[PDB]
Amino acid sequence: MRRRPIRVLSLFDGIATGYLVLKELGIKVGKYVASEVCEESIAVGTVKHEGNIKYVNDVRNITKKNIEEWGPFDLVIGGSPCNDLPARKGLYEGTGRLFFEFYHLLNYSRPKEGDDRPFFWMFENVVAMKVGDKRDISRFLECNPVMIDAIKVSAAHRARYFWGNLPGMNRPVIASKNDKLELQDCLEYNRIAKLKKVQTITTKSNSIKQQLFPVVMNGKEDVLWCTELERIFGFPVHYTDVSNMGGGARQKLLGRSWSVPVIRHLFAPLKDYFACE
Amino acid sequence: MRRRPIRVLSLFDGIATGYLVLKELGIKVGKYVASEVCEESIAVGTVKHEGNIKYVNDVRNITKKNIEEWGPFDLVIGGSPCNDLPARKGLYEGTGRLFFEFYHLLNYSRPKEGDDRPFFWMFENVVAMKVGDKRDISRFLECNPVMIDAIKVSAAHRARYFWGNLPGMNRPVIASKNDKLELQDCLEYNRIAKLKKVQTITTKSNSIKQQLFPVVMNGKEDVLWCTELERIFGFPVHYTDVSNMGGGARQKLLGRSWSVPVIRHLFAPLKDYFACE
Amino acid sequence: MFETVPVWRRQPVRVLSLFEDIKKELTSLGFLESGSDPGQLKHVVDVTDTVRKDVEEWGPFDLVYGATPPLGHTCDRPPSWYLFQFHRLLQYARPKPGSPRPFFWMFVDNLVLNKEDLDVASRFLEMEPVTIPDVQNAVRVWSNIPAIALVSEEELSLLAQNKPTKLVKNCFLPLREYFKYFS
Amino acid sequence: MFETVPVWRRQPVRVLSLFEDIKKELTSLGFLESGSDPGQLKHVVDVTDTVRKDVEEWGPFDLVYGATPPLGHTCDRPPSWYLFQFHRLLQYARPKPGSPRPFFWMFVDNLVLNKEDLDVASRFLEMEPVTIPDVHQNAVRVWSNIPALVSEEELSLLAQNKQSKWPTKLVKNCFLPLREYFKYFS
Ligand SMILES: Nc1ncnc2c1ncn2[C@@H]1O[C@H](CSCC[C@H](N)C(=O)O)[C@@H](O)[C@H]1O
Ligand SMILES: Nc1ncnc2c1ncn2[C@@H]1O[C@H](CSCC[C@H](N)C(=O)O)[C@@H](O)[C@H]1O
């Protein structure tokens, strides 16, 4: 009948990239339940979104009744940790086994056979991954992933796998007029980009230098800045200027975050199913 | 008859509080020569003002011919280091002896007799100071200081002495509609202020806790944040979000900075002597 | 909780045995019949590439059984893989909500799961396990079958340091009220 | 830089001597006379509360002199205080730009200023000093606008030794080119 605000369950929410993308698309968000452990990430989300996010702490403490009463959910998104997918413990040991939890809760949030209401879901992981692990993930999600690289809409390499049932996940990725496509577009004043794109930025500080420092300032080599990484990933400037965090902590948060333009591309079809502004 | 943009020489410029105040007042700035040696402060000024600040380096390398060439100057402002004004070396040893440099350069920038063109100057120092040092400073500047506390316009105690010939330096300080007068107005979301005003914030981190931590978040004690200190001092938020600086470096920069509303109070009469937007 | 069915309406049970086989072990109680080579038990081991349509073509089913490998056999696969694949194929095998009929599942563990694995299994199977001892061997069981003594945990802990369908068939007893009793 | 004045037009010089007095020392060259009520020399040691109108009330001056205390004198004041106060009172004593008259200044140091103090003094006085030595040992440094070979290690070790008074003998001859500008008493 009438479009209603979207209700979202986000697992491994990080710095609330999903809520930010949904709000920037103009979609009304009726409820955003986020499962997240890192206190700095929760602080970022809380401050930047003014308490519109209901945080529920660890994903493994979410119960079936929790999914029943917090719900119903229109969207179920998830982004498992990728530090185990050299001491890697694979999909089944360490923190890779968290993926199944997502799967678990996903089946708890699905509507029944008689319920034909709109319900969308998405799961993100890294491409660098055992082919057997990708096989098992495709098995448990009963579908195959799309591979999207942020380089077509951002100034950095970030190839990620996305499983889900969103409309047009395989449609071609085209850049927008506002997408800062080159590193120079993401730099502060008086700073020059050595390259046009930067290699995949992880949590460690060894992924900035390309290992040649990416920036030149006053003729001296220099690494990237927090606001520069924020522009690279598509976040608003000072999005992680929270909780007295230095360059290291904000880089840790942004190095595992989602590329905002990629999530925008994936969530754009949702505007034809829920209330907008 | 028609005014022109103001030309400013700022000694010990810091994070360019003077330029920020002059721009916020709407005064057209034709030249802003800043002497400053801290690379973080220079970076803050450069990025936040897009290179409009001609940065010179050590104040003691400025020559008489430098004052002649970079000049003429309409405003000469200065803010000497106050770490030597327990191991204090006074006004004549350590960094306190930098004050005279200001004095020196001030008399280089003063117009000659008969050159009745408008020329204003100002020098700031801390009240905590040997009365002999205050006496000698009043001697060298040939005038007496007005004491202004930032608590009447900001949410913090900051009593400072101001020498100068600016119009109305002794007039009463009245707050504005936008002055965040209490600590609660300066905090981020989901954070509660224990007090309404905070004690004098220095560069060290032991001046935040009042030693009771000033903020409560989620029922836990917490220190102030970088954006919170920025709001306390009257700077725009993220003004020091530069150069991968953490909480410590930004607090060091803001703890010796000027109170923006105080400098606005002192610089407001300048709108009737120079061009405005 | 299911109602009990009159004895004349009881049917030959269909079972899905994952990993471990209990074919003749289940005939020993009368649920299967000897002679039917196209019988009522489907046995699979490499479930890595089995899709929901595979389970649907092998069905319908009335019991889904999964078991960890025997303790002492060095596992080529991680212990949690069995639990996760059991859960997957079980959800593949559950009847649709618009056709409620007697349906049971059971996952047994031969003390191959540690504490975190036990917690994961209890979260996914929505119940705490039940231990069965032997005076020495023991098993853990999660099941929706209504079961009919007292042992502490350190016994099992030190027994695992040392280096089994006997304890399992007793759990299959309350199923007799739902299916045929051959032999 | 000034032009030399004809001898019949030369005047009795007026000097401002701070910290160290050269009154009886400057009479020896003829710039002062014994029978003078004002004395033409104004001497003052504690200049902490000296205002500009004080220097102005003390009559116009033609020479301003300041000196550091002798080396064998424990400084109660920091060594740079003398330099800064000399600069202040000198700027107080300069004639207005609308009256270009002969005017000279002189600051002398008895090796009480270290290297950073030397650089500060050379920055404020807009010139490098000149060293006057004493053979058989003392020495002085001089900054002055009067148009009047030893390495530094000698002075360094000499200053370290000479701790355990003020030599006007070395500064006296610097006042000689001032004779072409003021009266020369018998
Ligand atoms: N057991 C757990 N329960 C809930 N969240 C967890 C978790 N283990 C890790 N996480 C969180 O999951 C995040 C995965 S990084 C991905 C963040 C998010 N997809 C984004 O785009 O920003 C990490 O930041 C971590 O804090
Ligand atoms: N010798 C020197 N030459 C130039 N700048 C100096 C200096 N010694 C110290 N400074 C700078 O002077 C600053 C004084 S703190 C005052 C900063 C400024 N008044 C403000 O309101 O922001 C310090 O940040 C220091 O970096």
Tab-separated table of N, CA and C in Angstrom, chain A residues 108-183:
chain	number	residue	atom	x	y	z
A	108	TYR	N	16.812	-15.899	10.820
A	108	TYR	CA	15.846	-15.500	11.834
A	108	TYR	C	15.037	-14.289	11.393
A	109	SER	N	15.589	-13.458	10.510
A	109	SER	CA	14.915	-12.238	10.087
A	109	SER	C	14.129	-12.404	8.796
A	110	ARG	N	14.298	-13.520	8.094
A	110	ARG	CA	13.555	-13.744	6.864
A	110	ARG	C	12.065	-13.883	7.165
A	111	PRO	N	11.200	-13.286	6.352
A	111	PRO	CA	9.766	-13.545	6.492
A	111	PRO	C	9.427	-14.971	6.085
A	112	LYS	N	8.240	-15.407	6.498
A	112	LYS	CA	7.818	-16.782	6.270
A	112	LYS	C	7.475	-16.995	4.797
A	113	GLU	N	7.011	-18.207	4.481
A	113	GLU	CA	6.609	-18.509	3.111
A	113	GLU	C	5.378	-17.707	2.707
A	114	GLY	N	4.404	-17.584	3.611
A	114	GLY	CA	3.209	-16.817	3.311
A	114	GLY	C	3.426	-15.319	3.277
A	115	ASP	N	4.508	-14.837	3.881
A	115	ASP	CA	4.812	-13.411	3.915
A	115	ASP	C	5.591	-13.032	2.660
A	116	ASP	N	4.993	-12.180	1.828
A	116	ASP	CA	5.620	-11.713	0.598
A	116	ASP	C	6.083	-10.263	0.702
A	117	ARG	N	6.236	-9.748	1.924
A	117	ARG	CA	6.702	-8.387	2.118
A	117	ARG	C	8.132	-8.244	1.600
A	118	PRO	N	8.538	-7.031	1.224
A	118	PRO	CA	9.905	-6.840	0.719
A	118	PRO	C	10.929	-7.060	1.822
A	119	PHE	N	11.972	-7.822	1.501
A	119	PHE	CA	13.034	-8.118	2.456
A	119	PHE	C	14.336	-8.261	1.686
A	120	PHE	N	15.328	-7.446	2.039
A	120	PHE	CA	16.609	-7.433	1.353
A	120	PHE	C	17.740	-7.687	2.339
A	121	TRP	N	18.827	-8.259	1.831
A	121	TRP	CA	19.958	-8.612	2.672
A	121	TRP	C	21.236	-8.512	1.853
A	122	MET	N	22.351	-8.347	2.559
A	122	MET	CA	23.643	-8.206	1.903
A	122	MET	C	24.749	-8.580	2.878
A	123	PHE	N	25.772	-9.258	2.364
A	123	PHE	CA	26.942	-9.644	3.140
A	123	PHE	C	28.198	-9.311	2.352
A	124	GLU	N	29.168	-8.690	3.018
A	124	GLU	CA	30.408	-8.266	2.382
A	124	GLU	C	31.588	-9.047	2.944
A	125	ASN	N	32.531	-9.395	2.069
A	125	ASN	CA	33.787	-9.994	2.501
A	125	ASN	C	34.880	-9.609	1.510
A	126	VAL	N	36.112	-10.006	1.819
A	126	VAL	CA	37.271	-9.654	1.007
A	126	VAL	C	37.488	-10.713	-0.064
A	127	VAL	N	38.076	-10.291	-1.185
A	127	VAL	CA	38.338	-11.213	-2.284
A	127	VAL	C	39.473	-12.164	-1.922
A	128	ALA	N	40.553	-11.628	-1.353
A	128	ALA	CA	41.656	-12.453	-0.876
A	128	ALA	C	41.147	-13.446	0.158
A	129	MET	N	40.860	-14.669	-0.279
A	129	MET	CA	40.153	-15.634	0.547
A	129	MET	C	40.251	-17.003	-0.107
A	130	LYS	N	40.366	-18.041	0.720
A	130	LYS	CA	40.407	-19.406	0.211
A	130	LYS	C	39.175	-19.693	-0.634
A	131	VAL	N	39.391	-20.331	-1.788
A	131	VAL	CA	38.277	-20.628	-2.687
A	131	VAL	C	37.290	-21.581	-2.031
A	132	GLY	N	37.768	-22.446	-1.133
A	132	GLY	CA	36.854	-23.280	-0.371
A	132	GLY	C	35.987	-22.471	0.577
A	133	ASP	N	36.558	-21.423	1.175
A	133	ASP	CA	35.774	-20.547	2.039
A	133	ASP	C	34.718	-19.789	1.245
A	134	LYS	N	35.090	-19.274	0.070
A	134	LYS	CA	34.110	-18.640	-0.807
A	134	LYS	C	33.017	-19.624	-1.205
A	135	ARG	N	33.401	-20.874	-1.479
A	135	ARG	CA	32.430	-21.911	-1.803
A	135	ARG	C	31.442	-22.113	-0.663
A	136	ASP	N	31.947	-22.254	0.563
A	136	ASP	CA	31.064	-22.495	1.702
A	136	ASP	C	30.175	-21.292	1.989
A	137	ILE	N	30.690	-20.077	1.796
A	137	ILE	CA	29.862	-18.892	2.003
A	137	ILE	C	28.735	-18.852	0.979
A	138	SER	N	29.063	-19.113	-0.291
A	138	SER	CA	28.028	-19.187	-1.318
A	138	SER	C	27.033	-20.303	-1.027
A	139	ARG	N	27.496	-21.395	-0.414
A	139	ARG	CA	26.598	-22.480	-0.034
A	139	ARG	C	25.608	-22.021	1.026
A	140	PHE	N	26.119	-21.450	2.118
A	140	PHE	CA	25.258	-21.062	3.231
A	140	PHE	C	24.322	-19.920	2.858
A	141	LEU	N	24.743	-19.037	1.957
A	141	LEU	CA	23.881	-17.953	1.502
A	141	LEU	C	23.065	-18.324	0.270
A	142	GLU	N	23.284	-19.516	-0.292
A	142	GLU	CA	22.501	-20.033	-1.415
A	142	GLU	C	22.537	-19.099	-2.622
A	143	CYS	N	23.667	-18.429	-2.835
A	143	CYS	CA	23.831	-17.528	-3.968
A	143	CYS	C	25.314	-17.245	-4.148
A	144	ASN	N	25.645	-16.617	-5.274
A	144	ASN	CA	27.021	-16.290	-5.603
A	144	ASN	C	27.266	-14.789	-5.474
A	145	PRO	N	28.502	-14.374	-5.201
A	145	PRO	CA	28.772	-12.957	-4.958
A	145	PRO	C	29.084	-12.174	-6.222
A	146	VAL	N	28.816	-10.882	-6.144
A	146	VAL	CA	29.324	-9.922	-7.114
A	146	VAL	C	30.660	-9.413	-6.599
A	147	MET	N	31.564	-9.084	-7.512
A	147	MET	CA	32.855	-8.509	-7.152
A	147	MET	C	32.855	-7.049	-7.578
A	148	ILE	N	33.002	-6.146	-6.611
A	148	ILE	CA	33.000	-4.714	-6.882
A	148	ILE	C	34.279	-4.107	-6.324
A	149	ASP	N	34.976	-3.339	-7.156
A	149	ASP	CA	36.169	-2.607	-6.751
A	149	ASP	C	35.810	-1.133	-6.621
A	150	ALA	N	36.219	-0.523	-5.508
A	150	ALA	CA	35.924	0.884	-5.267
A	150	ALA	C	36.671	1.819	-6.210
A	151	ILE	N	37.621	1.304	-6.994
A	151	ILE	CA	38.445	2.156	-7.842
A	151	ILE	C	37.633	2.846	-8.932
A	152	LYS	N	36.480	2.296	-9.307
A	152	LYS	CA	35.661	2.920	-10.335
A	152	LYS	C	34.887	4.132	-9.830
A	153	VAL	N	34.861	4.368	-8.518
A	153	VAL	CA	34.077	5.461	-7.951
A	153	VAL	C	34.875	6.198	-6.883
A	154	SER	N	36.044	5.668	-6.528
A	154	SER	CA	36.892	6.280	-5.515
A	154	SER	C	38.329	6.291	-6.016
A	155	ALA	N	39.224	6.845	-5.198
A	155	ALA	CA	40.629	6.993	-5.549
A	155	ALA	C	41.499	5.890	-4.953
A	156	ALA	N	40.933	4.706	-4.725
A	156	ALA	CA	41.677	3.633	-4.081
A	156	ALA	C	41.207	2.284	-4.601
A	157	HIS	N	42.107	1.304	-4.529
A	157	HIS	CA	41.759	-0.077	-4.826
A	157	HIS	C	41.063	-0.701	-3.623
A	158	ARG	N	39.901	-1.312	-3.858
A	158	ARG	CA	39.194	-2.026	-2.790
A	158	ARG	C	38.210	-2.994	-3.456
A	159	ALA	N	38.709	-4.176	-3.806
A	159	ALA	CA	37.897	-5.209	-4.436
A	159	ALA	C	37.282	-6.091	-3.356
A	160	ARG	N	35.952	-6.115	-3.296
A	160	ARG	CA	35.233	-6.862	-2.276
A	160	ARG	C	34.115	-7.682	-2.905
A	161	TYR	N	33.816	-8.812	-2.262
A	161	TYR	CA	32.711	-9.680	-2.637
A	161	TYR	C	31.456	-9.281	-1.873
A	162	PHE	N	30.330	-9.251	-2.583
A	162	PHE	CA	29.032	-8.896	-2.019
A	162	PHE	C	28.018	-9.964	-2.410
A	163	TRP	N	27.562	-10.735	-1.428
A	163	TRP	CA	26.407	-11.600	-1.603
A	163	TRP	C	25.149	-10.838	-1.215
A	164	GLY	N	24.029	-11.211	-1.814
A	164	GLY	CA	22.769	-10.615	-1.424
A	164	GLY	C	21.717	-10.746	-2.503
A	165	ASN	N	20.548	-10.184	-2.192
A	165	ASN	CA	19.395	-10.190	-3.084
A	165	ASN	C	18.929	-8.780	-3.429
A	166	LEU	N	19.809	-7.789	-3.314
A	166	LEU	CA	19.448	-6.431	-3.676
A	166	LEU	C	19.220	-6.332	-5.185
A	167	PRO	N	18.337	-5.431	-5.619
A	167	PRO	CA	18.089	-5.284	-7.060
A	167	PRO	C	19.315	-4.747	-7.782
A	168	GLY	N	19.696	-5.425	-8.859
A	168	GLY	CA	20.756	-4.945	-9.729
A	168	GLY	C	22.146	-4.940	-9.131
A	169	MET	N	22.479	-5.944	-8.314
A	169	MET	CA	23.825	-6.026	-7.761
A	169	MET	C	24.879	-6.268	-8.834
A	170	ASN	N	24.493	-6.831	-9.976
A	170	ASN	CA	25.420	-7.110	-11.062
A	170	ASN	C	25.419	-6.027	-12.132
A	171	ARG	N	24.577	-5.007	-11.993
A	171	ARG	CA	24.556	-3.919	-12.957
A	171	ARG	C	25.894	-3.179	-12.938
A	172	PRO	N	26.266	-2.526	-14.040
A	172	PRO	CA	27.586	-1.894	-14.101
A	172	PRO	C	27.690	-0.702	-13.165
A	173	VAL	N	28.891	-0.514	-12.626
A	173	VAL	CA	29.171	0.571	-11.695
A	173	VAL	C	29.669	1.772	-12.489
A	174	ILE	N	28.922	2.870	-12.434
A	174	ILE	CA	29.299	4.114	-13.091
A	174	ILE	C	29.518	5.175	-12.021
A	175	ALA	N	30.504	6.038	-12.249
A	175	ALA	CA	30.858	7.054	-11.272
A	175	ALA	C	29.871	8.214	-11.313
A	176	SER	N	29.742	8.894	-10.179
A	176	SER	CA	28.879	10.057	-10.057
A	176	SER	C	29.681	11.335	-10.275
A	177	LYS	N	28.957	12.455	-10.346
A	177	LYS	CA	29.608	13.737	-10.586
A	177	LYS	C	30.439	14.184	-9.391
A	178	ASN	N	30.093	13.726	-8.189
A	178	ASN	CA	30.756	14.155	-6.967
A	178	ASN	C	31.824	13.182	-6.485
A	179	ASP	N	32.011	12.058	-7.174
A	179	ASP	CA	32.977	11.051	-6.744
A	179	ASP	C	34.393	11.569	-6.961
A	180	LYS	N	35.120	11.796	-5.871
A	180	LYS	CA	36.528	12.174	-5.949
A	180	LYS	C	37.312	10.971	-6.454
A	181	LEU	N	37.605	10.962	-7.755
A	181	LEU	CA	38.143	9.780	-8.414
A	181	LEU	C	39.657	9.654	-8.312
A	182	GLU	N	40.371	10.743	-8.045
A	182	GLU	CA	41.824	10.721	-7.999
A	182	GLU	C	42.318	11.191	-6.638
A	183	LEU	N	43.501	10.697	-6.256
A	183	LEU	CA	44.052	10.997	-4.937
A	183	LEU	C	44.187	12.498	-4.716
